[PDB]
Amino acid sequence: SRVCQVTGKRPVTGNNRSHALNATKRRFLPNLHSHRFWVESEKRFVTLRVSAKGMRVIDKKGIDTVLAELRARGEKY
C-alpha cells in the first residue's frame, strides 16, 4: 500500500471541483519514494518507502530516531 512508513501519510480522498463546481471523487496519492537510508549504528542500507515530507522528518530527528519509532509500533524494516 502506498502509505508512508514514517509520517503515516496515505492516499486521501477528495473531489475535482471544476469551474462549474462539478463534484467528482478523487484522491491525493502521497509522493512516496523508496529511498535507501544508511544507519551508522547498524551498518546497513535500510530502504524505506516514505514521502517527500517524510524524508525531511528523518533529517531533523534522525534515521536512528525514526526507526526507533517503527520497531515500537510493530513496523518492520
Binding site: 544508511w38 524524508m55 525531511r56 533529517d59 531533523k60
Partner: protein, 53 residues
C-alpha cells in the same frame, strides 16, 4: 541547510565550517558518506569543543 563539514571537500573546504548547502548535496553525498553533518545545534557545539580543545 547549514550543516558542518568533516572532510575537506571542494568549493567549501575548511575541514570544519557552516555553509548554506542545498539539502540535496548534503542529504545524498556529504552526510551519507562522511563529509558533512546536520547542524542540529547539538553538533555545532560538539565539534566546537574540538576547535578549542
Amino acid at each position: 541547510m547549514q550543516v558542518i563539514l568533516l572532510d575537506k571537500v571542494a568549493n567549501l573546504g575548511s575541514l570544519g565550517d557552516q555553509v548554506n548547502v542545498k539539502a540535496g548535496y548534503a542529504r545524498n553525498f556529504l552526510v551519507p558518506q562522511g563529509k558533512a553533518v546536520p547542524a542540529t545545534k547539538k553538533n555545532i557545539e560538539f565539534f566546537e569543543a574540538r576547535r578549542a580543545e
